[PDB]
Symmetry: D2
């Protein structure tokens, strides 16, 4: 589990359940190639996106579909998504947790990076 | 204005208007002595709390009554307030802006400290 | 485990290890009475502060000693501490996770509240 | 000024000065068309990006080059940038301030949307 995503709702104080998460990797030609995707569980976590073999060094993009989340709660939010773009594994393999904290007009994202 | 308070609402994307702010200074006996207070304006800002002459080095607390704000909006909040406690003018006099970003179950606070 | 505290360093992208956490409960006479204390583990978590029996409804204060943390890293931070003050268990027992995200001149705190 | 960008540094407690900001509008083919850009001022603010006449409804991206900022300071950052993507003027024309608070491993962004 080299890559995990954790998402929290700052309005309700609760994990964010069934939120779509897409991950992309920058290709040689500088386009984004689909890398992996999934939905958060009831703990607001998404595990198992990738493997140590698959998760090589590169620039990755994680886009969390915060708009669908807010809309399903009856709220028209400001952002289309929360996005995190980062260089991974450039000094060797690491483990990455991407945490996002969501409000209708604000979000924050944090990375927790550990050495396996 | 040595000390500036700016508050925003992360749910509505708006400044937080008319929220109470109390400033305390730590007294010798280690209790909080009320120092200054007011209400945020329509721009979410509270100016004129203190003066250069009055705002000496020491430890200060800024308490924002976030719970009354969420209560006015009909949204159940987690915190009783947001309080920011800091040592002032350690390296000399500066202009301080205490910014706070509010959500019902979360807040963040940031100090912007300039010349 | 009705009360857990989790603390992250936003400069280093890492859990915050050995940070002191004090919890107080407001007494009938409106003073703060020491309730519990501990230090974060290497996962930046502090478990076992209290029990369901002990953790009755009241107004609680969690103060995290962020100043000592930053100072031990050679940084002179803005805040004396990060504090969270909240009413607990007023609609029945809940489980509370208090997460704090720390930078030298900023912090955020979030509560995740679940129904056991 | 329909669109305002303000950036702060949570490590130093300061506005972030001279960081590059690029604004894009989503084109019909769904690629990002560069729209406006500049550098934040000494107050960390970028004004004058667009005008009322030019800033029509649509989907916009604001990209803040946070990685060059941390690089100038000698601090290893996590993100390549901070990017904020939003639908504009859904309910009509408004004044938008995109605020961002930066740390090496974390950022937050907030929209303040007024009359
Ligand atoms: N894991 C805990 C809850 C929890 C863990 C983390 I790690 C976390 O991380 C952040 C990220 C950002 I971005 C913030 O602004 C803040 I404050 C905390 C948050 I939130 C909540 C549990 O449910 O048991
Ligand atoms: N003057 C304008 C814009 C403004 C917003 C913030 I907000 C701010 O400070 C913060 C603090 C935190 I804490 C954040 O997470 C973020 I994102 C921005 C400052 I200086 C300026 C207004 O507020 O209308």
């Amino acid at each position: 589990c080299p890559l995990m995503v954790k998402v929290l709702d700052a309005v309700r104080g609760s994990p964010t359940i069934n939120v779509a998460v897409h991950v992309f990797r920058k290709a040689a030609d500088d386009t984004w190639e689909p890398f992996a995707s999934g939905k958060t569980s009831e703990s607001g976590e998404l595990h198992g996106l990738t493997t140590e073999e698959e998760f090589v060094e590169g620039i990755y993009k994680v886009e969390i579909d915060t708009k669908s989340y807010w809309k399903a709660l009856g709220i028209s939010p400001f952002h289309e998504h929360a996005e995190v773009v980062f260089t991974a594994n450039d000094s060797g393999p690491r483990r990455y947790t991407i945490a996002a904290l969501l409000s209708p007009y604000s979000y924050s994202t944090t990375a927790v990076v550990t050495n396996p």
